[PDB]
Amino acid sequence: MFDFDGYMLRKAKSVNKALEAAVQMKEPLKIHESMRYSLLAGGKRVRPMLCIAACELVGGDESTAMPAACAVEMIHTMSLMHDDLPCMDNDDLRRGKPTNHMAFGESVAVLAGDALLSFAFEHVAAATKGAPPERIVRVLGELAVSIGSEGLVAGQVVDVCSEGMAEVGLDHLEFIHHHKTAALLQGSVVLGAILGGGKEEEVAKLRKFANCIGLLFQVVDDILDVTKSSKELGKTAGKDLVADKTTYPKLIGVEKSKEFADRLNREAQEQLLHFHPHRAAPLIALANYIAYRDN
Amino acid sequence: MFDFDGYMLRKAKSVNKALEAAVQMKEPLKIHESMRYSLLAGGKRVRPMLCIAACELVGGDESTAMPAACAVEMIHTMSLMHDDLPCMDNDDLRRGKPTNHMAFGESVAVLAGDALLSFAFEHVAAATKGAPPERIVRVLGELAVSIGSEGLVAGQVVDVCSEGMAEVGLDHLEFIHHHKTAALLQGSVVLGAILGGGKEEEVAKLRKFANCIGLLFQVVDDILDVTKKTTYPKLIGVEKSKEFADRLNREAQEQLLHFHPHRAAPLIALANYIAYRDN
Amino acid sequence: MQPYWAAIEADIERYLKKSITIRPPETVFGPMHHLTFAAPATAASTLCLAACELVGGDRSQAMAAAAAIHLVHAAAYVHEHLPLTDGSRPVSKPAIQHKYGPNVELLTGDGIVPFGFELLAGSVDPARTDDPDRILRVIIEISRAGGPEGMISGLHREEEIVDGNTSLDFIEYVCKKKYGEMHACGAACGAILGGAAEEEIQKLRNFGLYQGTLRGMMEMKNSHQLIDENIIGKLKELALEELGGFHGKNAELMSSLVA
Amino acid sequence: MQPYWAAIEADIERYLKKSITIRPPETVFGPMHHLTFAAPATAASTLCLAACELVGGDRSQAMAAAAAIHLVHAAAYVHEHLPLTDGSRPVSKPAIQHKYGPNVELLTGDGIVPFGFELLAGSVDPARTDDPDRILRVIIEISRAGGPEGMISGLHREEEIVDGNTSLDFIEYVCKKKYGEMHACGAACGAILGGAAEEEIQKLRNFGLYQGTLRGMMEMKNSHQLIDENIIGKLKELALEELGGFHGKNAELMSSLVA
Ligand SMILES: C=C(C)CCOP(=O)(O)OP(=O)(O)O
Ligand SMILES: CC(C)=CCSP(=O)(O)OP(=O)(O)O
Numbered sequence A: 001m002f003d004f005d006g007y008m009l010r011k012a013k014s015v016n017k018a019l020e021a022a023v024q025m026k027e028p029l030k031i032h033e034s035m036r037y038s039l040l041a042g043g044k045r046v047r048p049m050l051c052i053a054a055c056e057l058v059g060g061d062e063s064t065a066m067p068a069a070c071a072v073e074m075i076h077t078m079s080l081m082h083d084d085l086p087c088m089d090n091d092d093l094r095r096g097k098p099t100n101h102m103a104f105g106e107s108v109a110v111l112a113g114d115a116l117l118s119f120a121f122e123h124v125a126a127a128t129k130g131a132p133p134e135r136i137v138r139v140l141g142e143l144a145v146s147i148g149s150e151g152l153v154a155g156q157v158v159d160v161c162s163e164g165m166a167e168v169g170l171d172h173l174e175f176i177h178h179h180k181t182a183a184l185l186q187g188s189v190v191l192g193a194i195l196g197g198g199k200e201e202e203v204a205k206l207r208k209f210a211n212c213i214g215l216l217f218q219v220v221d222d223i224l225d226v227t228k229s230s231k232e233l234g235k236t237a238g239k240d241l242v243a244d245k246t247t248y249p250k251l252i253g254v255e256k257s258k259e260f261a262d263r264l265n266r267e268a269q270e271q272l273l274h275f276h277p278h279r280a281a282p283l284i285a286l287a288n289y290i291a292y293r294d295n
Numbered sequence B: 001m002f003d004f005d006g007y008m009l010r011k012a013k014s015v016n017k018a019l020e021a022a023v024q025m026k027e028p029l030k031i032h033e034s035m036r037y038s039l040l041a042g043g044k045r046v047r048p049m050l051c052i053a054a055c056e057l058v059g060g061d062e063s064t065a066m067p068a069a070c071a072v073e074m075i076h077t078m079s080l081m082h083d084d085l086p087c088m089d090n091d092d093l094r095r096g097k098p099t100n101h102m103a104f105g106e107s108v109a110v111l112a113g114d115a116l117l118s119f120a121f122e123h124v125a126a127a128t129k130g131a132p133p134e135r136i137v138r139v140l141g142e143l144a145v146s147i148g149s150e151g152l153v154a155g156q157v158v159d160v161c162s163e164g165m166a167e168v169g170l171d172h173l174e175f176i177h178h179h180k181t182a183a184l185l186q187g188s189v190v191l192g193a194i195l196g197g198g199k200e201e202e203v204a205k206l207r208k209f210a211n212c213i214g215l216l217f218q219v220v221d222d223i224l225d226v227t228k229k230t231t232y233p234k235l236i237g238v239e240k241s242k243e244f245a246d247r248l249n250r251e252a253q254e255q256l257l258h259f260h261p262h263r264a265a266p267l268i269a270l271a272n273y274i275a276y277r278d279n
Numbered sequence C, D: 001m002q003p004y005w006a007a008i009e010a011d012i013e014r015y016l017k018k019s020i021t022i023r024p025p026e027t028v029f030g031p032m033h034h035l036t037f038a039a040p041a042t043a044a045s046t047l048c049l050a051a052c053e054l055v056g057g058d059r060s061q062a063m064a065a066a067a068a069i070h071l072v073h074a075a076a077y078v079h080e081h082l083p084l085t086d087g088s089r090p091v092s093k094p095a096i097q098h099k100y101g102p103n104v105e106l107l108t109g110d111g112i113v114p115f116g117f118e119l120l121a122g123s124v125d126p127a128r129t130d131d132p133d134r135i136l137r138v139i140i141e142i143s144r145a146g147g148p149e150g151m152i153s154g155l156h157r158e159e160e161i162v163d164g165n166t167s168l169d170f171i172e173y174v175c176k177k178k179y180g181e182m183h184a185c186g187a188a189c190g191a192i193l194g195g196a197a198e199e200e201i202q203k204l205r206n207f208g209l210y211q212g213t214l215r216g217m218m219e220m221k222n223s224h225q226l227i228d229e230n231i232i233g234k235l236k237e238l239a240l241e242e243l244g245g246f247h248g249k250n251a252e253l254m255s256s257l258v259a
């Protein structure tokens, strides 16, 4: 019988403990203080868990996936640090503390964000043990594609550049969410699946599954942005309200939005049938959590 | 010898090169910037030369003695940085440039000075190649002894403590000079001589040569100030001060009578330069 | 610049244009394309191809790495000239031109750096044996040189340079960090991809370190001229020494870069 | 435990008092003796003798190093407390009293540091063949820990701390440099002088590093309270974990200050 609250609590402790060891204070002190301030402040660690669970699922173990797990969380973090900046969404609260730029200045926030980005590649590349070199290289390429101009960054740029778009087609709103949010989650599930020794078909099935929960994650993000408070979320909530932004709660309203998340979850879990139900329990659990989290 | 100046200049050069490589700018930047500010400010590099010359004198090579040469210049330099301080001589200038604490603050001047002192031991200990471990430890022993409470620092305390009782006699003035100047030259020549593998007898003669030129320098220096408080002239007069200088110079040179004439030449040439400087 | 270097530089430019083709979404790839070429050219990149050739290999073996180096640098240049509202970065006289707004520059910077690793992970040829161990090693050099202890420490400390009251020593350190390490990385990566032995890699690395440092001082000379040729002779000397041991039709070109 | 650590501070103290005889000129040795002993003792020295015995050596084999560590520590203590003209170093609220003027305290610290190295070189027993290498190594260890990279760095960054406005990450870092480096050094030297293999030395060095950071972090709690206990345990956890492989009382008595 699957105790999800228990599984996540320990996975996150384990992920938090490795994030703290991988990014230590060292000269130049402010850059490093700024990296740790946002990285270890306190996210849910969905991506690093997804990575670890996909690796364990296809036969590998946490230790081989941990550096990539940390890497996806490094890149996730810097992407929020850069998203919060005044030239971007200009927020004052993230993970329950003042945003990084407000505590270190805009200069350091940009630089430390860049530092985390580069170091995620250094760390996965240099610290992964238990994987042939061609396998690491391959994972670095997957990571690169999922966070760049055909992934995270592309989603984010069409996002700020489509904030006046009032004639927002769903095909356009899906381009954004798939890229700015689903792309990074897919990469997280893929790095794990490949590092655990998974066969191409299992990788392909988990990529599909990941695209599902990846979209589900953004729909859910948009619904909390609208039904929860800033204290609750830990970040500034309600700006997506005002702006001409393309959230789902826009084009279909919170209700037709919830039903949609419901279909997505199911659809994702349907991809998990490829695997033995006992082994898929963690990813099934991470999926409902993505759907049912309060923050 | 021929071209003594060219010889001091080749030495200052290879030493400066080695100093630059030994102490690079790095974090924390103000500490390291302050260390190089004073260490690399150019000077005659006499101490390093003594170390190197002594090593070569007994068969060693410049290469083995270089870390030790850099070390004594390191010590020399931080003794000057500390001495310029407001609580010491309170100097705002040295050789035409702002003194170290005026450029970076008293705190960094103090700390950078401390960094040069322990780094001298580290560089000697860790960069010396071509010497057996016991030799290197002996040599670190002589450096400590030459700059501590029975060497440089003693000469520096007793002096700041005698800037008050203007009744200092010949013996007291020599104490300060021997400790404030000769001890560290003695240290330079001894590390070189030991790292070079010279006999105990050889080391002792070199130790004597240094004590003589160390004092020779302060005496001569007093003579020049006059023919341009306690000084050799206020204590024994210029005539006798000069007789003394010549005796010091002659004694220094006597120490070198038994080494190869050609290896001894730079040392003999340095003693005469010290004795006859016009300035 | 010299014919040889400008020709190497042009191949990297060609390789970059053939690699970044403007397509939809143009709102994404136009800025990506423009900003790549708007960054100044960097020798840490041509040096990667050159270092390669010198030790053995063929320049094509190092192209992907050379492109990645340019891109990591391009991303850093874009971010360092970013319009910052709060006056966090000492409003630098630069005032360079900006075709796009701050947000798109910020983000494009962020998309350019991963592109560098992409070309690297995807330049892996089935017909190359030791391909993955060297690519991997090169990714590590690149992500370190562009990371918090490399080029980033250089950009950070550069904000503390107060025009004519900051020493030559400090400035040389910022150029060491900001340009030296990337150049050292470029020559080493090239050396690696070429197939040299540890001893040569370090020699070329040390050469890149000094040359990039000297180059940064040159671009800093046009700023505050306190730069004596004492500082330049120093670095030039340090550079050529590391090159002692390489003779031939390029090992005199590699030398020309500093001479 | 309780009386073991005391007999230790006392042996180190009787060796120091036997090594620093006030004598002529008292103007020099009066201050040297006074300041050595007016300096709060440091666990870095204690730790050195304990690690030497822990690995099997005789307490005397480490006495010179242990006294050198106190001397290096004493010098830094005297120097970090110098009344200064310019407002360089923030004013310590808990101000120490001075029986001697600034000049004499500054110079004395300059004489204390080399006295430690003198004691070490002078402790080589010519009838003991392993003596030079172990002592050589120890001098490298202490000169590095009290140097620009170790203790000096913590002393220097310490001045950037604003009492109610400085993160715990910054502070733990200043403690790892100001205290941790030296404690790590003390345990490592104690193990070296004791005959231990590389494996035991590193483990012991690691423990000391965590112990000092931890102990210095308490020296600080006095001052700025933001004194989380989440860092206290993160460190002793990492500490007490380095002991793993080592078991018993001392192999778990070291786990007595981490209380
Ligand atoms: C909706 C997106 C793309 C990012 C914010 O994600 P998270 O909700 O994962 O926030 P954290 O837990 O990391 O703080
Ligand atoms: C998807 C990325 C890279 C960043 C955040 S998207 P967002 O600004 O819509 O949401 P939040 O800032 O998390 O509130």
Ligand SMILES: [Mg+2]
Residues within 6 Å of the ligand: A083, A089, A159
């Ligand atoms: Mg946003």
Ligand SMILES: [Mg+2]
Residues within 6 Å of the ligand: A083, A084, A089, A091
């Ligand atoms: Mg936002």
Ligand SMILES: [Mg+2]
Residues within 6 Å of the ligand: B083, B089, B159
């Ligand atoms: Mg004086």
Ligand SMILES: [Mg+2]
Residues within 6 Å of the ligand: B083, B084, B089, B091
């Ligand atoms: Mg003076």
